[PDB]
Design a protein around this ligand. Structure first.
Ligand code: HEM
Ligand code: HEM
Ligand SMILES: COc1ccccc1CNCCO[C@@H]1CNC[C@@H]1Cc1cc(C)cc(N)n1
Ligand SMILES: COc1ccccc1CNCCO[C@@H]1CNC[C@@H]1Cc1cc(C)cc(N)n1
Ligand SMILES: C[C@H](O)[C@H](O)[C@H]1CNc2nc(N)[nH]c(=O)c2N1
Ligand SMILES: C[C@H](O)[C@H](O)[C@H]1CNc2nc(N)[nH]c(=O)c2N1
Ligand SMILES: [Zn+2]
Lengths: 411, 407
């Protein structure tokens, strides 16, 4: 079967055949679409099919499908599974796997970059201190003094589900949040619960508006341990505005390195529960979401006050007006400091070119519209007008429960 | 089978039970989500009739009463005897209000129960359709104090005698391809404008010419009518700060009025059912004015503001966008023509969802359509999980008549 997507701005029609390789389910049915829902220990029996699919894909990509090397590798994995109940990926398979998980990430607008990913194999890691060292090297490498490089670090896979490696931080670099007795929050309200855990674990909190959180690292199912990332390794950008000189006095800054650390990488049926990955920011992630969500830094009011906008009626579009100025400031600040960042116009345009390329060469590009369209100025970006098909390919990045809900404390 | 929706801003969780009565299909499967696709006889009719009359009699607290049973029998008799049936006025009013209540792509549904229904089922000619439409236009406009309305022409019979308004909206501006090469007026209406011209319309060939209505009665060939200009309320667009804004020479009409959809009530199909309310500002300022394939005025406005257009990252598009949208709202407000901004409209819709969850057990919503085309995440609907499903009565899309009609 063939499925068609139209672009309503250009009349370009694309044909998707790749959806036919989709195994995992969406959450939708013929009766309900769950396309805006945020979140919609294996047997030998289930594992060999999953290994086999993956290795067929791997061997096709290198143009070795059906070769003796392909067949030997199948038999070798077959045997390893029946005997040890799991298997180990070759380095080449791990790299390929990690790239394809990003390639297949339908909520990611940055996928034009998927083939340039530095993969750090941390499968020889055994302790939290070992994880810290690996994560430091990743941060240093990825930061590269502001000239950001995409990377992922991959810690040992799940075995019995009792020995999981986890990074408890949701991102490697984030700011603490502190709930005050008066109900207000200092710092980032998204991070209050995790900040509370860090404190209970013995972190001494500076208690400011931009305190970089310590890493909380679990190796081998053991209790997590605290580590402070060396501050010289944490690149930060002070936010100022090109025409508004009062903007710097808001006291705003952000970190340069977006690095997601709470997801699970599935490759060939294996589950990598700690696989922090990083790229570079699209401006709106900071300027729209981090700064202007009501449940985050929520600075729209204070900015609009300072701009002397008419604030008595929403219909002045004061919020929209302040929103644009903050986003200009974020992009200006990163650019002035020579820290890589991409605006939403440039990122969405590139994504459209990527998606079209993917249709021609791969027969599809799964994409989640709800996530791909930027959170400001949606319809003046070319993706708004682009029909998309969302479906699940493996290898993949998946969500997993927060570890403080599942972890068996050892004491 | 009982489903949760969460708001990620407020942590409020709602439980949806209403989806279990969804009848029509979505386009999605367990394997593939089609959430972002624009367009994804005797025997069939009685189930549909029963389903509808059952909900109707439940709504007036008379489910299972003799008056309920007697109507079901009467309708059964009529279908068996005549191959179709006729709705009572009360059923028609209820069906129309509910097609709107069920419209998952409509952010304005807090208003659903205040809908003026004009019963045009006695209409027989295109001139009759024109009279009914002028009256609708004048009632809804109400000197700028807009009132929601729908006018319902006769239902489909054998499908060879369809009533249709050929216009996509009652009030739209013409579009002409130029010797230049570009496009004068609204590029969306170029083809419809050609059909008008080929059927006799004398076009003034300007940027903002109100198109004529093209009306089809009883499956006959459509006929042209100009709407009395005095009934088409229009707004010149100016900015509260930028004096030069007026010089672009922009105007828009006050009455949004969709006229190409099909109303389905209890299995009956009303192929001509123009309806109208009032605008959310972004529909005009973001979509009509700024879509590349529309009036596409971003480039010209940015220039008048003297912004740096060398690089996308100065956000000159975003800056100009907000101003265009401030101007729309300001101009409608100054001329006392009802309009709603996207902040107010999305806030009301969140309130409406909560009402519908509390009183009905759900509210079908299409997030892709409900979230405004500018400033998405600073409106509360961005953070609201929504379940999309199809309930009946409904407004449905239908093919453009020029592709179906034989002359
Ligand atoms: C190269 C620069 C990149 C840019 C500009 C970019 C852009 C983005 C943005 C804007 C989001 C949405 C985040 C949100 O709204 O919460 C996202 C999501 C995501 N991206 Fe990227 N991306 C980049 C690199 C990467 C890399 C290197 C990977 C993995 C190797 C990746 C995988 C993902 C995944 C799995 C998500 C979904 C996250 C979630 O569901 O919470 N991206 N991307
Ligand atoms: C009272 C003020 C109203 C407001 C502010 C409003 C708001 C909107 C908006 C912004 C859209 C999306 C339009 C687009 O982006 O193309 C829409 C769509 C829609 N509305 Fe409303 N609405 C109103 C009244 C009505 C009424 C009176 C009806 C029917 C009786 C209705 C039924 C629909 C339907 C069926 C759609 C989807 C149109 C399509 O699929 O192309 N709405 N509404
Ligand atoms: C309450 O939050 C949630 C809950 C469930 C699922 C997803 C989320 C939100 N997404 C979490 C990850 O997204 C963060 C937001 N900004 C940076 C990061 C995404 C990202 C990753 C990378 C590698 C690059 C980039 N530019 N952006
Ligand atoms: C190119 O456009 C399309 C093509 C196919 C399907 C749907 C669409 C989009 N809908 C077309 C009709 O919608 C128009 C857009 N602005 C006004 C009207 C929607 C509307 C209706 C009503 C009753 C009120 C309101 N405020 N807005
Ligand atoms: C409920 C809704 O799905 C949710 O708010 C989504 C919408 N789109 C998004 N898009 C991105 N890129 N990131 C997000 O966190 C969200 N949140
Ligand atoms: C392809 C995509 O579905 C299309 O551009 C949609 C997106 N959301 C929309 N939302 C509204 N309200 N109106 C529209 O016309 C569209 N267009
Ligand atoms: Zn779906």
């Amino acid at each position: 079967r063939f499925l068609k997507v139209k672009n309503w701005e250009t009349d370009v029609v694309l044909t998707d055949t790749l959806h036919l390789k989709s195994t995992l389910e969406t959450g939708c049915t013929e009766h309900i679409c769950m396309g805006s829902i945020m979140l919609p220990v294996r047997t030998k029996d289930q594992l060999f099919p999953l290994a086999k699919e993956f290795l067929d894909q791997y061997y096709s990509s290198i143009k070795r499908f059906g070769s003796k090397a392909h067949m030997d590798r199948l038999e070798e994995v077959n045997k390893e599974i029946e005997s040890t109940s799991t298997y180990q990926l070759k380095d080449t398979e791990l790299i390929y796997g990690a790239k394809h998980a990003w390639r297949n990430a339908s909520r990611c607008v940055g996928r034009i970059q998927w083939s340039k990913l530095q993969v750090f194999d941390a499968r020889d890691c055994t302790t939290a201190h070992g994880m810290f060292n690996y994560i430091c090297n990743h941060v240093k490498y990825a930061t590269n003094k502001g000239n950001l490089r995409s990377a992922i670090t991959i810690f040992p896979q799940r075995t019995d589900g009792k020995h999981d490696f986890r990074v408890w931080n949701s991102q490697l670099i984030r700011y603490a949040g502190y709930k005050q007795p008066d109900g207000s929050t200092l710092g980032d309200p998204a991070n209050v619960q995790f900040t509370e855990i860090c404190i209970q674990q013995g972190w001494k909190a500076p208690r400011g508006r931009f305190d970089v959180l310590p890493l909380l690292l679990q190796a081998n199912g053991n209790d997590p341990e605290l580590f402070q990332i060396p501050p010289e390794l944490v690149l930060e950008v002070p936010i100022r505005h090109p025409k508004f000189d009062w903007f710097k006095d808001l006291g705003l800054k952000w970190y340069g390195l977006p690095a997601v650390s709470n997801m699970l990488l599935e490759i060939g049926g294996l589950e990598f529960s700690a696989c922090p990955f990083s790229g570079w920011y699209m401006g709106t992630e900071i300027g729209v979401r981090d700064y202007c969500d009501n449940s985050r830094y929520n600075i729209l009011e204070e900015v609009a006050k300072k701009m002397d906008l008419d604030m008595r009626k929403t219909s002045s579009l004061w919020k929209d007006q302040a929103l644009v100025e903050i986003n200009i400031a974020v992009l200006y600040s990163f650019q002035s400091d020579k820290v890589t960042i991409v605006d939403h116009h440039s990122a969405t345009e590139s994504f459209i070119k990527h998606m079209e390329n993917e249709y021609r060469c791969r027969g599809g590009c799964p994409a989640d519209w709800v996530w791909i369209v930027p959170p400001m100025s949606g319809s003046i970006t070319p993706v708004f007008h682009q029909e998309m098909l969302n479906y699940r390919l493996t290898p993949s990045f998946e969500y997993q429960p927060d570890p403080w809900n599942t972890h068996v404390w050892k004491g």
